[PDB]
Design a binder for this molecule. Structure first.
Ligand SMILES: CCCCN(Cc1ccc(-c2ccccc2-c2nnn[nH]2)cc1)C(=O)N1CCN(C(=O)C(C)(c2ccccc2)c2ccccc2)[C@@H](C(=O)O)C1
Ligand SMILES: [Zn+2]
Ligand SMILES: [Zn+2]
Length: 599
């Protein structure tokens, strides 16, 4: 209570008129502190992009397409996700498991910091990020009072105290664009949250800003590679002699981050300068190893905001989440590789006094080589161990809390002998042969997921221009990343013919760190395609440009169909034949603008 008390005291004082202890609060593993009356945020479903929907009529039926728009962010949805996923306790790992993890984490941070030194991130760096991604964040960073509030909170952090770094589980709250932009104490709430984000970015942002998890720095990492490079990396891993390629999914990774993992992640502060270490130690102790969280809850008499806390799990919407998840997953997979190799036994995991020297010997002689066999991005991993003993090496993985999703905990993992079947970052990758004989390695995922996502707009209250510009952003992302899917190349051509040529793509198609957003432009898509797949592609030795889309390949028809294509169906042939009519209908509603025919 001495670490979280001031944050709760300030909340309690600000909402003194309705603050109460609700005896029928549902929290079982989070400490519950109190509630106050609040207006309900979120919406029961996502708004549909009318431009994309009109140009993808055969997918109006398709069940996965309908499900993608059913995300519920109201208090009911906030509580549903909370109860089904976040309100659990991860059993403490055994003493031998804790020892191996500690040894591996120390070796791993030392390896990651061999060339780079941690540093503080700055006000202008944060401001520049906000401005390049643009707006309430831009208004906040241009207000001197926002930075003065940041300074006061930093002075508390230097004293080992925290007053306003409270995270929340509400995500995007507005039901219509600008709903809270001019509301009562919205500015103060936003300044405190964005200020907390700034302080975290100041102390831990170096991990992302200085590419600590780049493949060159981390061996296993893929930070800064891009979706268009991930397949090539899996193809390169497939050439390393060894067993099958394993890609186990953890059930709710962020909820399985234990107090032991947090204490191993904190070890990076040992490489910092005294002034940086003091600020990063405040972030770790005050907001990672202790956290104060707001979440809404429906009650018989309306909505309340509950104030809860806990000492483990990975927080809601944090700067260091991706990098720290990548670190801990690299460590966990090295531990699993040691178990597969016979370095760690079941008796060792139970033993606090296990032989530290055999772990150090394996890390010092094989560690880097074993990191090179992996592609790790947050909770996503691909591992090609030295043989298949790894498939049944589950003692440490389960004991560290990283229980695999939807599989009995002692059933052996299933690995893949074809890198093209390996799931990684919600995709799988194909090697395609171009008409000229050159090979491409492309990203792919179930087509219903791509169409379903593209049919969701920024939200209610956005103009037809902003909606059409987001539709154009999805169409152009398809032209650059998923051109090999017949239906997507056709729909992309339809959308780009329906939206005025000089309207610039707005919003974002995804928040994924692997998206480099090369499609966020009004440049010719074939020119951008050549830049990404030919000119800048390090795995393309022959730089001969492709002069027509007729020479940009597709997946084989059978694979396109296995992966969701409607090619071959009557409704799809009817759609393809009558698409100029739907394009014209969109153009008529947009108005007298300059359009280009891409069909
Ligand atoms: C200048 C005043 C700005 C008042 N404000 C803040 C805010 C919103 C709702 C509430 C709120 C209302 C009622 C009851 C309780 C609370 C409350 N209680 N505690 N925390 N929330 C309070 C603060 C606001 O208008 N926003 C907030 C940010 N939003 C975003 O969509 C978005 C994508 C964004 C990114 C970049 C640049 C700009 C925006 C973003 C989402 C989530 C996390 C980060 C960034 C909109 C939203 O989430 O509604 C609009
Ligand atoms: Zn704070
Ligand atoms: Zn595919």
């Amino acid at each position: 209570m001495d670490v979280i008390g001031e944050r709760i005291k300030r909340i309690k004082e600000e909402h003194n008129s309705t603050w109460h202890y609700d005896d029928e609060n549902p929290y079982k593993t989070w400490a519950y502190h109190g509630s106050y009356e609040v207006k309900a945020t979120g919406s029961a479903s996502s708004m549909i992009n009318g431009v994309v929907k009109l140009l993808t009529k055969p997918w109006d039926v398709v069940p996965m397409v309908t499900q993608m728009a059913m995300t519920d962010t109201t208090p009911f949805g906030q509580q549903r996700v909370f109860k089904e996923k976040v309100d659990t306790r991860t059993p403490r790992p055994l003493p031998g498991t804790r020892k191996v993890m500690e040894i591996t984490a120390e070796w791993l941070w030392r390896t990651l910091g061999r060339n780079k030194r941690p540093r503080l991130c700055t006000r202008e760096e944060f401001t520049k990020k906000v401005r390049t991604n643009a707006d309430s964040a831009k208004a906040a960073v241009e207000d001197e009072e926002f930075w003065k509030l940041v300074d006061r909170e930093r002075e508390l952090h230097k004293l080992g105290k925290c007053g306003s770094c409270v995270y929340n589980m509400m995500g995007k709250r507005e039901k219509k664009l600008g709903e809270f932009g001019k509301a009562k104490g919205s500015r103060a709430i936003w300044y405190m949250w964005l200020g907390v984000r700034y302080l975290e970015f100041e102390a831990l942002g170096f991990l992302n800003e200085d590419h600590w998890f780049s493949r060159e720095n981390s061996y296993s990492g893929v930070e800064g590679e891009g979706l268009h490079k991930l397949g090539y990396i899996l193809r390169d891993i497939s050439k390393i002699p060894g067993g099958a390629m394993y890609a186990d999914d953890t059930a709710g990774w962020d909820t399985r981050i234990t107090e032991d993992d947090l204490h191993n992640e904190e070890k990076i502060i040992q490489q910092m300068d005294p002034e940086h270490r003091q600020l990063a130690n405040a972030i770790f102790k005050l907001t990672y190893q202790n956290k104060v969280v707001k979440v809404q809850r429906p009650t018989p008499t309306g909505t309340v905001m509950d104030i809860i806390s806990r000492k483990d799990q990975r927080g809601s919407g944090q700067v260091g989440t991706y990098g720290l998840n990548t670190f801990t997953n690299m460590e966990a997979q090295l531990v699993r590789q040691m178990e597969g190799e016979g370095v760690l036994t079941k008796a060792d995991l139970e033993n606090p006094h296990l032989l530290e020297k055999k772990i150090t010997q394996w890390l010092e002689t094989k560690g880097v080589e074993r990191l090179k066999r992996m592609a790790i991005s947050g909770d996503d991993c691909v591992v090609k161990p030295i043989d298949d003993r790894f498939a049944n090496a589950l003692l440490a993985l389960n004991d560290m809390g990283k229980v695999r999703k939807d599989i009995p905990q002692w059933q052996p993992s299933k690995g893949w002998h074809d890198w093209q079947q390996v799931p990684f970052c919600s995709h799988h990758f194909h090697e395609l042969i171009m008409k000229d004989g050159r090979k491409l390695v492309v990203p792919c995922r179930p087509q219903d997921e791509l169409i379903g996502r593209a049919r969701i707009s920024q939200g209610a209250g956005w103009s037809l221009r902003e909606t059409a510009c987001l539709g154009k952003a999805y169409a152009q992302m398809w032209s650059l990343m998923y051109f090999h899917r017949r239906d997507l190349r056709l729909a992309s051509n339809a959308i780009c013919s329906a939206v005025p040529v000089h309207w610039v793509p707005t919003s974002r198609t995804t928040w994924s760190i692997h998206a480099h957003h090369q499609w966020m432009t009004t440049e010719d898509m074939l020119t951008v395609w050549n830049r990404v797949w030919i000119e800048e592609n390090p795995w393309m030795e022959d730089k001969t440009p492709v002069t027509t889309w007729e020479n940009v390949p597709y997946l084989g028809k059978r694979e396109d169909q296995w992966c969701g294509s409607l090619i071959g169906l009557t409704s799809r042939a009817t759609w393809a034949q009558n698409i100029p009519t739907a394009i014209q209908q969109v153009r008529s509603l947009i108005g007298n603008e300059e359009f280009l025919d891409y069909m």
